[PDB]
Design an enzyme around this catalytic site. Structure first.
Site, short mmCIF file in Angstrom:
data_model
loop_
_atom_site.label_atom_id
_atom_site.label_comp_id
_atom_site.label_asym_id
_atom_site.label_seq_id
_atom_site.Cartn_x
_atom_site.Cartn_y
_atom_site.Cartn_z
N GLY A 124 -9.37 47.83 15.16
CA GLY A 124 -10.65 48.15 14.47
C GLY A 124 -10.60 48.19 12.95
O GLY A 124 -11.55 48.65 12.28
N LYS A 155 -12.92 44.24 12.21
CA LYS A 155 -14.07 44.20 11.30
C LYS A 155 -14.41 42.77 10.81
O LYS A 155 -15.59 42.46 10.55
CB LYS A 155 -13.84 45.12 10.12
CG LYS A 155 -13.87 46.57 10.47
CD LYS A 155 -15.35 47.06 10.62
CE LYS A 155 -15.45 48.58 10.89
NZ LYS A 155 -14.72 49.02 12.11
N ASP A 231 -19.99 52.53 12.48
CA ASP A 231 -19.17 52.98 11.35
C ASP A 231 -19.28 52.10 10.12
O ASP A 231 -19.39 50.88 10.23
CB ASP A 231 -17.69 53.19 11.76
CG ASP A 231 -17.00 51.90 12.33
OD1 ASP A 231 -17.63 51.12 13.07
OD2 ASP A 231 -15.84 51.64 11.96
N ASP A 232 -19.25 52.75 8.95
CA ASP A 232 -19.20 52.06 7.67
C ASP A 232 -20.38 51.14 7.49
O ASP A 232 -20.22 49.96 7.15
CB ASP A 232 -17.89 51.26 7.54
CG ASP A 232 -16.64 52.15 7.45
OD1 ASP A 232 -16.74 53.40 7.49
OD2 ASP A 232 -15.53 51.55 7.33
N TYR A 271 -18.51 59.99 11.46
CA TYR A 271 -17.35 59.82 12.36
C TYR A 271 -16.18 60.69 11.95
O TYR A 271 -15.13 60.69 12.58
CB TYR A 271 -16.96 58.35 12.50
CG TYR A 271 -16.54 57.62 11.25
CD1 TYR A 271 -15.25 57.78 10.71
CD2 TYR A 271 -17.40 56.70 10.64
CE1 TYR A 271 -14.84 57.10 9.56
CE2 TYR A 271 -17.00 56.02 9.49
CZ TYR A 271 -15.71 56.24 8.96
OH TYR A 271 -15.33 55.52 7.87
N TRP A 326 -10.22 58.45 17.49
CA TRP A 326 -9.82 57.22 16.77
C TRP A 326 -8.87 57.67 15.68
O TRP A 326 -9.32 58.20 14.65
CB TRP A 326 -11.06 56.55 16.15
CG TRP A 326 -10.91 55.29 15.28
CD1 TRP A 326 -9.99 55.04 14.29
CD2 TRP A 326 -11.80 54.14 15.28
NE1 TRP A 326 -10.26 53.82 13.71
CE2 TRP A 326 -11.35 53.26 14.30
CE3 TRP A 326 -12.90 53.79 16.06
CZ2 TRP A 326 -11.95 52.03 14.06
CZ3 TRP A 326 -13.53 52.63 15.78
CH2 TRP A 326 -13.02 51.72 14.81
N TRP A 327 -7.55 57.47 15.87
CA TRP A 327 -6.56 57.96 14.89
C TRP A 327 -6.13 56.87 13.90
O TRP A 327 -5.62 55.82 14.31
CB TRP A 327 -5.35 58.61 15.57
CG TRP A 327 -4.45 59.34 14.62
CD1 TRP A 327 -4.83 60.30 13.71
CD2 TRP A 327 -3.03 59.22 14.48
NE1 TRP A 327 -3.74 60.74 12.98
CE2 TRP A 327 -2.62 60.12 13.46
CE3 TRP A 327 -2.08 58.43 15.09
CZ2 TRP A 327 -1.31 60.23 13.07
CZ3 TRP A 327 -0.77 58.55 14.70
CH2 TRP A 327 -0.39 59.45 13.72
N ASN A 328 -6.42 57.11 12.60
CA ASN A 328 -6.18 56.13 11.53
C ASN A 328 -4.78 56.16 10.94
O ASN A 328 -4.57 56.38 9.75
CB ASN A 328 -7.23 56.24 10.44
CG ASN A 328 -8.54 55.59 10.85
OD1 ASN A 328 -8.55 54.46 11.33
ND2 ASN A 328 -9.62 56.32 10.69
N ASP A 333 -5.08 49.17 5.87
CA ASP A 333 -6.03 48.18 5.36
C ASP A 333 -6.63 48.62 4.02
O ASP A 333 -7.33 47.85 3.38
CB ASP A 333 -7.11 47.81 6.43
CG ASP A 333 -8.02 48.99 6.79
OD1 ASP A 333 -7.89 50.00 6.12
OD2 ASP A 333 -8.83 48.91 7.75
C1 LIG Z 1 -14.32 54.70 12.36
C2 LIG Z 1 -13.69 54.11 11.14
N1 LIG Z 1 -14.05 52.97 10.70
C3 LIG Z 1 -13.23 52.42 9.59
C4 LIG Z 1 -12.12 51.53 10.11
O1 LIG Z 1 -12.59 50.22 10.43
C5 LIG Z 1 -11.02 51.37 9.04
O2 LIG Z 1 -10.00 50.46 9.48
C6 LIG Z 1 -10.45 52.73 8.64
C7 LIG Z 1 -9.31 52.65 7.64
O3 LIG Z 1 -9.81 52.05 6.42
O4 LIG Z 1 -11.55 53.48 8.06
C8 LIG Z 1 -12.69 53.69 8.91
S1 LIG Z 1 -12.50 54.85 10.24
#
Ligand SMILES: CC1=N[C@@H]2[C@@H](O)[C@H](O)[C@@H](CO)O[C@@H]2S1
Ligand SMILES: [Ca+2]
Length: 642
Positions: A124, A155, A231-232, A271, A326-328, A333
């Site tokens: 992701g 993405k 997201d985003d 999120y 969802w663990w970052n 990236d």
């Molecule tokens: C939910 C999230 N959506 C985004 C991810 O696509 C990114 O990879 C991650 C790190 O930049 O930041 C946020 S967390």
């Protein structure tokens, strides 16, 4: 070291041999995926099956009453491999395969099952999506480590995100996806196809139907779990009522209508805690209105964070269900010049009950991410028994048996992210950190340093060089080596520089010192060329390594010993630590075709066509390709290079 470690293990301190002659009871009625593994592996009775099968009736009260649970027994008289369900039987076999060492099995009895229901990987991230071949490799890795979930959501896949989420995949990508789903199914992994429509979604019939139409196409390729990510994004797609209504519609008209759909998951716009309005209705709207079967994802108290008891209580109270984590980490990236190859840690090991799932967001470097992925598999299956460092070591030895010690050396000094806008850091080089810190304190103040500390640093630089050369030539996992190669070159150079800088500290005579000093300047220049030629992405171009402890030590030691040389010999040697061909007390930087002052006059090393200048005390001026070497007055010159 069984990984993940079973919930319950009793060992008999006896061994037996894999029966050369054996009787197999339950082959035709057990999970065909489990039977194939067993048959690959190979009279004495061997009983395989799921609870309810004739083959395993005698052991029905030993089989854990948990989804994905199994009973495994090995003794003198027989072998038992009994799942609570088909997936459990597969998993009994994955543990069985780890016990078998050199034609021999220990005498053991295991009762096992996962503490978290959904475990695995969300692809992701932003950046180059994993290759097809990488993904095939990942899916097999997940089956061995009992991960039941793979969420597809890069993405930068135009058929996943806006605007071409509306279009079906073309034929070649579609055949690939179909192959991935087949392979996933063979390794007992749910392939979860995600969509990211929120940036340009209209809340109308046309776009709703297009989304359902896309999900139908994915279904035809064999997909049986689905996600919608919000997201985003910005704009009208952030509307929680409409989000809940769309997910409920997908659930009611698709997920609950098909014969065989499994997961339906959603990632919210809010999120993480820092991105959520405590005085807004967003999270409560979703919690109240989303059908109770729909999973809701969460990244913790910040975009990048580890999961705590209190943080998860906070979200769970609002969404009215256990969060799907969802663990970052190891996702890189946003620090693309770093590899994050350290251990997995920081997550509360007592909160399994509070989560519906746990997935890792990995690096764009597929094989490299297997260190963290193996560790997350162990953690999510048995958090109570999760051992940070043993698991990291087991992962490395699994991934690269032929050069495990060499990969440990490289990984241990390639763990931190450096400073970043997300505020997230990891430990690095902790073993030598105190020796470094003493040596430099002593040395800087003109107090004598301990011999043992100097020797330790010396040993470290030597071992780094060995590790680098050996990793370069390793052919056991070629794709891993291709991924890391640039960093490995940079790691060797760092070690060579450290070696020469320490010879300067031992400073025999003026002449020797000058040879060492010139060697170091050349090494700096070589590091700058890697930083400009490798991994030239648009965001954090280049290659950084050993950044937390080793590079700072080498740099400060170099600058110190040059200062003392200049005092003793009344000299004027340059003490600067990073090579820079352009001249300007702040350090210039070079990033792609930009030359930059780290936040009066600049002289470039040649005449270039000027592109533009961006100053900021949003000042801007195009230079219409005007030749430029000098520039007198963020502070960024852009040039044609390019
Ligand atoms: C939910 C999230 N959506 C985004 C991810 O696509 C990114 O990879 C991650 C790190 O930049 O930041 C946020 S967390
Ligand atoms: Ca069966």
């Amino acid at each position: 070291s069984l990984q993940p470690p079973p919930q319950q293990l009793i060992v008999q301190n006896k061994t037996i041999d894999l029966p050369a002659v054996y009787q197999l009871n339950g082959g035709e009625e057990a999970n065909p995926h489990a039977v194939k593994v067993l048959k690959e592996l190979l009279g004495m009775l061997i009983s395989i099956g799921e609870k309810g099968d004739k083959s395993v009736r005698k052991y029905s009260r030993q089989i854990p009453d948990h989804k994905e649970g199994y009973y495994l027994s090995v003794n003198e008289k027989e072998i038992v491999l009994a799942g609570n369900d088909e997936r459990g039987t597969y998993y009994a076999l994955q543990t069985f395969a780890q016990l078998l060492k050199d034609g021999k099995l220990p005498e053991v009895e295991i009762k096992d099952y996962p503490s978290v229901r959904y475990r695995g990987v969300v692809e992701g991230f932003y950046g180059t999506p994993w290759s097809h071949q990488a993904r095939l490799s990942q899916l097999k890795f997940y089956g061995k480590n009992k991960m039941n979930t793979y969420i597809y959501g890069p993405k930068d896949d135009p058929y996943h995100s806006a605007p071409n989420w509306r279009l079906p995949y073309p034929d070649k990508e579609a055949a690939q996806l179909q192959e991935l789903v087949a392979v996933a199914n063979e390794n007992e992994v749910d392939f979860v196809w995600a969509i990211h429509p929120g940036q340009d979604i209209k809340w109308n019939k046309e776009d709703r139907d297009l989304l359902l139409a896309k999900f139908e196409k994915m279904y035809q390729l064999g997909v049986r779990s689905f996600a919608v990510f919000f997201d985003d994004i910005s704009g009208e797609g952030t509307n929680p009522q409409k989000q809940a209504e769309l997910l409920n519609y997908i659930d009611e008209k698709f997920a609950q209508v098909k014969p065989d759909i499994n997961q339906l998951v959603m990632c919210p716009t809010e999120y993480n805690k820092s991105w959520s309005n405590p005085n807004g209705n967003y999270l409560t709207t979703l919690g109240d209105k989303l059908n109770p079967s729909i999973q809701i994802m969460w990244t913790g108290d910040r975009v990048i964070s580890d999961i705590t008891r209190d943080g998860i209580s906070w979200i769970n109270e609002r969404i009215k269900r256990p969060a799907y984590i969802w663990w970052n980490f190891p996702v890189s990236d946003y620090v693309r010049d770093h590899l994050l190859l350290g251990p997995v840690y920081g997550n509360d090991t007592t909160i399994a009950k509070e989560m519906s799932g746990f997935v890792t967001n990995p690096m764009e470097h597929a094989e490299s991410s297997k260190i963290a992925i193996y560790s997350v598999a162990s953690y999510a299956w048995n958090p109570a028994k999760y051992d940070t460092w043993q698991t990291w070591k087991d992962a490395i030895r699994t991934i690269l048996p032929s050069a495990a010690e060499e990969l440990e050396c490289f990984a241990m000094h390639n763990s931190d992210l450096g400073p970043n806008g997300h505020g997230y850091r990891r430990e690095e080089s902790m073993d030598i950190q105190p020796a470094a810190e003493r040596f430099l304190k002593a040395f800087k103040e003109g107090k004598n340093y301990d011999k043992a500390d100097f020797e330790t640093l010396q040993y470290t630089f030597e071992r780094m060089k060995e590790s680098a050369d050996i990793l370069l030539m390793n052919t056991e996992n070629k794709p891993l080596i291709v991924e890391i190669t640039p960093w490995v070159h940079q790691f060797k150079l760092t070690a060579e520089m450290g070696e020469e800088v320490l010879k300067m500290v031992e400073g025999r005579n003026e002449s020797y010192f000058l040879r060492k000093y010139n060697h170091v300047k050349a090494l700096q220049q070589q590091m700058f060329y890697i930083d400009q030629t490798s991994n030239q992405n648009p965001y954090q171009p280049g290659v950084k390594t050993a950044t937390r402890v080793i590079k700072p030590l080498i740099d400060r030691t170099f600058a110190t010993v040059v200062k003392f040389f200049n005092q003793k010999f009344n000299a004027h040697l340059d003490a600067t630590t990073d090579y820079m061909p352009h001249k300007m007390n702040l350090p210039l930087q070079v990033k792609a075709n930009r030359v930059l002052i780290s936040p009066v006059e600049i002289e470039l090393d040649a005449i270039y066509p000027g592109e533009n200048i961006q100053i900021n005390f949003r000042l801007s001026a195009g230079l219409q390709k005007a030749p430029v070497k000098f520039v007198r007055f963020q502070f960024v010159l852009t040039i044609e290079k390019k």
